[PDB]
Symmetry: C3
Subunit: 274 residues, 3 copies
């Protein structure tokens, strides 16, 4: 949308000099518009096109700028109080709205405005940061975190204590992406624009960043940055040349199967009743 | 209790066809009764009998059915709002009740109805899911999670970020059980009906599921599914046949002792003052 | 401050016999004063002097005693309720105060009274326990935990799901300390009075306690209890004498550099706008 994209990459340029006071209602209204698009899935930080994921860097820019253009305001907690600049997504909703939007929100699950939550999802108590996208049928288990701009596919299981890297701090080039039908094991972490291809299964306590060797015991091939579709990954270590010690790595132990499928399936009864 | 057990395994059968509208007050009232029993420790998903743990599969069924029989309702958060079908355990309590019930609840700790919290326990901010049982003197540290139906013994220390596997999603046969006097290290995960025998000490960052080899460097014996009473467990790796790489495992490095005891003890001063 | 220090080590002595009812307003008022000092950074559990960190054991004592001298009171959550004895730090604040105090508090971030939060910090939803100190420019990412009495330096990045060991349960001699300009990777844990020297980078899923070997592949030197300033640490394993298995350890793979710096930097735009 040029009418927005234009006013946005304009200000980004002066990012360090804009402030909640010296900013022009022009740029203010836009960033506000661009944020509202993201909040509704109408727009999205990243997308797959021609079998390639592509980042809309300028939408990341709008997210960054929301922080320069808005001011902190006190939020009345019950027993305590908050002071921040990003509104609560679900604060205006009524039952009607929740009813039509079709996902479930378990307290005290929390979502920031500018994040997209699809139909038939379940948010156990967790966190969804600004500009992120969570597709249909997905579950975000307890204490899990969907980082700023992260892309979550359909029917994905993010187990408890799972973290999906953002792009705000530390600043990142690309968002983290989990393709459809992936299962992420408890307390695992996926960061730095790593891509998990669809139908993959990451075990518990597995940590993947750009420096993580993803080793295929079968091929002897070592990957970096992505998990080939349909893989089952678990933690391991590779040894030093002198065999003096070993360092962490992610090992692809096999391709997903019936046995694997029996342990990682989604529970439809937990989903929205039509 | 046949009068309940009967009406329950009846509906479970038609699980996918019951809904918050087409359900008969008969089945509704029961599931509601069976849930209230669990909420009070009067009933419990699993129990030890003749030195064996036994699952009451039909009580798991009632838990599953609570999700088909009830409807989501909006929950008024302070700064935000929720939409879910399982009530907050502590929402009706007054000081009187808390006073007699004898445990401590640190905000923003959250418990679902149908979960049993014993006397003299301490809940740092954490999560206790439906149908779970937490015995006396136990502490659940910050961001820890007690999964649906999990069984937690007396005087147990679940450190920060510790996760205890549930049985809802992914669907499990047996609950996860931690026997009395066990200490679980920070950020560790115990899932898939694995049993931790009493007085055991699991270090930090240890992950145990049914596929996890629990290795005894002493005996050379490898366990699966349970931690022998009085063990001290830490993370390790076992090597491949060709020595080309190594995979994660849980190593039993020793039996608990004075040295160990000095690091994992409970702090009575933190407990309820009589 | 002798006038306080005196009345404090007096009662600590009778710790198990004091109670919220049999305690003298003298000792009550003090502990209350000593707690208020800590809440304001005026006092602090530990400090560096002559290039050595030193614990004020008697201030730890006051923290312990706050638990014997105060009584639990019900806290009104919105949808639920709490029962605890330590007040919410930010419950009395108004915008004016937040404005002058200069940090940001993202809901549902929670801080206990008696904890020091510096200027220009950012608390994503997380936990800061009593008696802890968080210095300037620091960020505490989502679901992170700053344990009781822990010391956090300036410009530190505690990533998501990171845990910093406390001293309450299990009872500890010294607090955990993170020096200035340190970066802690996602889901990592630092406990038992271990010290991380300034400008160090700990990767993801790294767990450090007193029994953790911190191995320097370069020197062959093994550390215990501290991370030498400017180190980059990642998980690994060291092998058994018979090569029968391997056990977890923290490996110092290199000294921090430009490459490293590009991945772990702070985002000023996220900080307080002057
Ligand atoms: C990845 C799987 C599913 C294992 O795959 P499968 O069962 O299909 O395979 P398998 O035949 O058992 O394993 C094949 C090879 O992989 C190895 N292997 C598999 N999983 C392993 C693991 N976790 N650790 C070590 N090795 C593992 C086997 O040893 C074997 O060795 P060889 O091939 O050499 O012989 C499991 O380990 C896993 O990650 N489960 C996830 C559990 C989880 O995180 N649940 C969410 C809980 S959280 C929740 O529900 C609520 C509570 C909470 O919030 O915490
Ligand atoms: C398991 C223990 C207690 C260690 O047992 P001990 O101290 O009795 O034994 P030890 O003599 O030191 O160790 C015996 C053998 O086990 C090995 N060993 C022991 N612990 C190890 C560990 N974590 N990593 C690697 N190896 C370890 C030793 O190297 C040694 O090797 P050899 O036998 O071959 O010579 C410790 O490692 C541990 O797990 N501590 C838990 C800390 C924790 O999680 N605290 C909660 C923080 S959470 C909190 O309080 C609030 C903050 C928050 O919420 O995060
Ligand atoms: C430590 C670093 C920064 C890596 O250091 P560098 O990039 O400078 O070094 P490098 O050249 O890539 O690595 C040098 C040596 O260290 C090894 N190495 C480095 N990092 C490693 C890792 N994580 N695992 C295994 N090995 C690793 C290399 O293999 C290499 O081997 P050789 O030397 O032998 O060749 C990275 O691994 C890391 O920890 N990143 C942190 C990401 C993170 O936690 N972000 C926060 C996400 S949380 C968030 O933002 C919101 C979402 C949420 O809340 O979860
Ligand atoms: O400052 C904020 O409000 C957001 C910080 C997010 C830190 C992790 C991320 O990059 O998502
Ligand atoms: O749908 C819910 O409300 C509960 C899901 C729980 C997921 C983990 C478990 O099996 O405990
Ligand atoms: O009882 C409490 O309120 C605090 C317990 C803290 C447990 C972990 C720590 O030592 O910080």
């Amino acid at each position: 949308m040029q009418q927005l994209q234009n006013v946005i990459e304009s200000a980004f340029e002066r990012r360090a000099d804009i402030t909640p006071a010296n900013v022009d209602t022009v740029t203010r209204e836009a960033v506000n518009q661009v944020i509202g698009l993201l909040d509704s899935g109408a727009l999205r930080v990243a997308e797959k096109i021609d079998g390639q994921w592509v980042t809309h860097q300028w939408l990341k820019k709008a997210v960054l700028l929301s922080f320069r253009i808005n001011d902190n305001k006190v939020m009345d907690g019950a027993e305590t109080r908050y002071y921040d600049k990003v509104p609560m997504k679900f604060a205006d909703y009524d039952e009607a709205r929740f009813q039509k939007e079709g996902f479930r929100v378990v307290p005290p699950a929390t979502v920031r405005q500018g994040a997209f939550i699809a139909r038939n999802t379940v948010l156990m108590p967790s966190y969804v940061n600004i500009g992120a996208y969570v597709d249909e049928g997905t579950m975000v288990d307890t204490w899990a975190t969907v980082g700023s701009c992260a892309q979550i596919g359909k029917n994905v299981h993010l187990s408890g204590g799972v973290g999906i890297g953002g792009v705000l701090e530390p600043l990142q080039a690309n968002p983290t992406i989990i393709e459809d039908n992936c299962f992420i094991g408890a307390r695992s972490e996926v960061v730095e624009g790593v891509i998990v291809e669809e139908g993959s299964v990451i075990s518990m306590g597995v940590y993947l960043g750009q420096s993580t060797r993803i080793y295929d015991r079968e091929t002897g091939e070592i990957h970096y940055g992505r998990v080939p579709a349909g893989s089952v990954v678990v933690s391991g270590n590779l040894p030093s040349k002198d065999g003096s010690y070993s360092l962490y790595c992610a090992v692809i132990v096999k391709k997903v199967d019936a046995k694997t499928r029996g342990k990682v399936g989604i529970n439809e009864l937990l989903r929205t009743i039509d």
